[PDB]
Ligand binder design. Structure first.
Ligand SMILES: C[C@H](O)c1ccccc1
Lengths: 217, 216
């Protein structure tokens, strides 16, 4: 039940981008790959399909022939290339797989493409330390400020995924500098502060940055 | 002609436990080739129904789908907090595949006042020239809230930005961050940093503050 898609990519206007979709499990069954576009905070638009079995393809005419779908049936991998890019192509692209009698059974997680002239920049990660000023009665809030990066996205986990409850990772905000920033916070028991460590795990794949920041009271 | 899927309502607010139905009208005959998907705030999309009424095997029984002439419906028998999401229909009778405009399903719940927390800039950040002071409003409802900053009792303007999460999947609340950005020199020259919060859940504004001189 897992389709894998290539990572986020920054590309310049007038260039091109090629992303991939593949089933995670060795399969051998004949699937059809459907591709869908979603601009930030907007709806869904069908892009086209590729049937690796026979190379069949079809495209939404709205794309004006800018999209090309190909595949490597040897690895059961489908690829979507977009040409002559402009900022209207900044969007998350999704693939879904269909079988005989089983339409759109599985969806990939999407690939985030940003079309921009600006250079990638990795984030600085700063602690939001718990203190009396972030402690109720028994509950303390703490977090990490992930500042000054481009393009989106960053990912944030806590304690390598062991801490998920009470976590709020805010949507990124574009600063006047043209760089993004966000904070991820979590509430935990105050009594855990002297003994349980809290580390935010931040990844910014466009700049190949990975940082693990320990947040101390 | 391309098939138009007209989805309504585009936004639906509903109490927990409520039976809610979403409608998608096909502009041409799709013969039951109607698919409904759910998209969660983190971007995850999953299949709910296909062939108009067949429930995907991993979806809870409170979801069902039906057809009445050219009208297709997705109904949730009694709404749960985890159902907060955007729902879309899609026809697969013909190409191009076409989607409904979606329905954002919002959850009505009782008023909850926020817990308010404030965080001074880290010394690590100060070493780099800029200072960010963060005020967190956690787990509140409804969404309307006002946050004001005062630095040594003077109201700030223009130097803060807010970010708000989507409704929480477990308790249907929101959280909000207000970040005040100052140069390190401006931060060091002032002393009292206060975040002032107004929300329907609070009788009077709550102010959380710290004095740079004492840490947090
Ligand atoms: C079954 C239909 O062709 C579909 C499903 C998911 C995404 C795009 C198209």
């Amino acid at each position: 039940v897992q389709l894998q898609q290539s990572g986020p990519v920054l590309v310049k206007p007038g260039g091109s981008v090629k992303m991939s979709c593949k089933a995670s499990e060795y399969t051998l069954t004949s699937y059809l790959f459907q591709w869908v576009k979603q601009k930030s905070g907007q709806g869904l638009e069908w892009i086209g399909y590729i049937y690796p079995y026979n190379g069949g393809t079809r495209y939404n005419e709205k794309f004006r022939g800018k999209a090309t779908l190909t595949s490597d049936k040897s690895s059961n991998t489908a690829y979507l290339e977009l040409s002559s890019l402009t900022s209207e192509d900044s969007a998350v692209y999704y693939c879904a797989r269909s079988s005989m009698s089983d339409p759109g059974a599985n969806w990939g997680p999407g690939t985030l493409v940003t079309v921009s002239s600006a250079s990638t920049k990795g984030p600085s990660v700063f602690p939001l330390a718990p203190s009396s000023k972030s402690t109720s009665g028994g509950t303390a809030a703490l977090g990490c400020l992930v500042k000054d990066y481009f393009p989106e996205p960053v990912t944030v986990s806590w304690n390598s995924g062991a801490l998920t409850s009470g976590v709020h990772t805010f949507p990124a905000v574009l600063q006047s500098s043209g760089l993004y920033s966000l904070s991820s916070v979590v509430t935990v028991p105050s009594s855990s502060l002297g003994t349980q460590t809290y580390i935010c795990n931040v990844n910014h794949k466009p700049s190949n940055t990975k940082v693990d920041k320990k947040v101390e009271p | 002609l391309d098939i138009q899927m007209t989805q309504s309502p585009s936004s639906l607010s509903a109490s927990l436990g409520e039976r809610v139905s979403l409608t998608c009208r096909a502009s041409q005959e799709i013969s039951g080739y109607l698919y409904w998907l759910q998209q969660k705030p983190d971007g995850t999309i999953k299949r709910l129904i296909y062939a108009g009424s067949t429930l995907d095997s991993g979806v809870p029984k409170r979801f069902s789908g039906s057809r009445s002439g050219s009208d297709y419906s997705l109904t949730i028998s009694s709404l749960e907090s985890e159902d907060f999401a955007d729902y879309y229909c899609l026809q697969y009778a013909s190409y191009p595949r076409t989607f409904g405009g979606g329905t954002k399903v919002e959850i009505k719940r009782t008023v909850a006042a926020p817990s308010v927390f404030i965080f001074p800039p880290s010394d690590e950040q100060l070493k780099s020239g800029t200072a960010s002071v963060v005020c967190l409003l956690n787990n509140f409802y409804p969404r309307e809230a006002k946050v004001q900053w005062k630095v040594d009792n003077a109201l700030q303007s223009g130097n803060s930005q807010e970010s708000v999460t989507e409704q929480d999947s477990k308790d249907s609340t929101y959280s909000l961050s207000s970040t005040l950005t100052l140069s390190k020199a401006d931060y060091e020259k002032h002393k009292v940093y206060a975040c002032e919060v107004t929300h329907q859940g609070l009788s009077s504004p709550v102010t959380k503050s710290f004095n740079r001189g004492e840490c947090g």
